[PDB]
Each structure stands twice: as C-alpha cells, then as structure tokens.
Amino acid sequence: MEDIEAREDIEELKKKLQEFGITFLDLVLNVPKHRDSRQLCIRLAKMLAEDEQMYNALMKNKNIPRNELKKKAKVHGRTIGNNRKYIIALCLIFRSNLNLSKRYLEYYTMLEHHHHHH
Amino acid sequence: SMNRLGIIYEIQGMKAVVLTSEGEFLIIRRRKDMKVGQQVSFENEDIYNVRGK
C-alpha cells in the first residue's frame, strides 16, 4: 500500500548500472536541463524498455542499440550519446522492481498531451 | 519556495541523489527523512549543482 521502494531494489538497480559503468552521480551529470529535453530522454528510455529486443540488446552490449533507438524515436545520435547513461538508467527502472520510480517517470512522460515548445 | 517531490536513490555523505517529480536525478541537501528508497518532498533550493562545462 505504501509508496516506498526498497534500498535493496534501489541498489540492485545500481548493481546493474555498475555493469554498464554508471553511477547515480553519472546520472545527475546526464540530467537534461529543461522539461522538453527530459520528457524526450525518459521517453527514449521508455521505448527502449517497452521493446524486449531493444532492452536485451541494451543489456548484452552494455550500451544502447543506438541505431534501433534512432529509427523508433526519430532522434539524433548526438542526443542518444549525450544522455546515454541517463537513458539506460530509466530503461532499467521500467523493468526493474522500482515501480514507484517507474510510476514517476511514466506519468511525467505522458505529459506530452500538449507539447509544442514555442 | 518551490517544491519538488522525489525518491531517494543514494545517500552520499551530507548530500543525497534523489529523483525529482520530473525524473531528474539531482543532488540535494541530506535530511532526517532520508532513506534510500523513500520519497522526500524538498525545495528546489535544496538542489545542488554539479556545475557543467
């Protein structure tokens, strides 16, 4: 009932990040400056987790399947590379026991119901 | 004067890496109510800077 995540699950996520060479500090460095950017980056991570083939490629390569992400997201490879560690983290969250953080990320990315930056 | 709600992902000494309500992993000022895995409602002014260049 309670909306808490377990430290053991948080750090289990971290153990996965350690396999990629990512810390929680790396994530802060890769944090997008504004809303447009972060909705976009978390959305990339979302579709990367939404697809099993992409997620499995991500795990085995320890890097994002950049070409496959680029064809589905229609983003720049430069976007992918700059936010790579960050995108990996959220992707992992959507498929990891971090259901509350999943919920935070999912509700934030669905907020593109009106999204024109002008 | 601006609240951000988030989830605590790591305690790092006197600071903590938390998620914000925008999914940002940001370092804020460590508090009493902090435990890795719990939620925290903090100020945007608790947020540190990594400083980027």
From Swiss-Prot, chain A:
Coiled coil: none annotated. Induction: Up-regulated in the presence of cellulose. It comes from the Bacteria. Residues 66-85 bind DNA. It is found in: Cytoplasm. Interacts with RsgI1. Belongs to the sigma-70 factor family. SigI subfamily. Sigma factors are initiation factors that promote the attachment of RNA polymerase to specific initiation sites and are then released. This sigma factor is involved in regulation of cellulosomal genes via an external polysaccharide-sensing mechanism. SigI1 promotes transcription from sigI1 and celS promoters. This is RNA polymerase sigma factor SigI1. It comes from Acetivibrio thermocellus (strain ATCC 27405 / DSM 1237 / JCM 9322 / NBRC 103400 / NCIMB 10682 / NRRL B-4536 / VPI 7372) (Clostridium thermocellum). The gene is sigI1.
From Swiss-Prot, chain B:
It comes from the Bacteria. Residues 2-53 are cytoplasmic. Anti-sigma factor for SigI1. Negatively regulates SigI1 activity through direct interaction. Binding of the polysaccharide substrate to the extracellular C-terminal sensing domain of RsgI1 may induce a conformational change in its N-terminal cytoplasmic region, leading to the release and activation of SigI1. The lineage of its organism: Bacteria, Bacillati, Bacillota, Clostridia, Eubacteriales. This is Anti-sigma-I factor RsgI1. Interacts (via RsgI N-terminal anti-sigma domain) with SigI1. Residues 4-51 form the RsgI N-terminal anti-sigma domain. The CBM3 domain binds to cellulose. It is found in: Cell membrane.
